[PDB]
Write a protein that binds this DNA or RNA. Structure first.
Length: 84
RNA sequence: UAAUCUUUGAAGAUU
């Protein structure tokens, strides 16, 4: 539901990672992840995500899935300019 | 989720 491209690429959320994470119910990783801007965040890997403090594999899997959706929309030039 | 928490992220727990 919040795991859809329309929701994941909302500029308001992309520009406020704690809130982006909250929508995915992943806000416990906000301290670990919020210092990285979205455009860098979506390209982190499983190994890096764990180094940063995403200790639950299920969480890293959900993160990587959401990231790849954003990437596809970024590649297709389908994220609003106001997110940049 | 009405809310909060857990990871397995579709479910479970608590109030």
């Amino acid at each position: 539901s919040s795991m859809n491209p329309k929701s994941l690429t909302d500029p308001k959320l992309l520009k406020n990672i704690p809130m982006w994470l909250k929508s995915l119910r992943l806000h416990k990783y906000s301290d670990a992840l919020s210092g990285t801007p979205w455009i860098e965040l979506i390209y982190l890997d499983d190994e890096t995500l764990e180094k940063k403090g995403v200790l639950a594999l299920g969480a890293r899997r959900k993160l990587l899935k959401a990231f790849g959706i954003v990437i596809d929309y970024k590649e297709r030039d389908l994220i609003d300019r106001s997110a940049y």
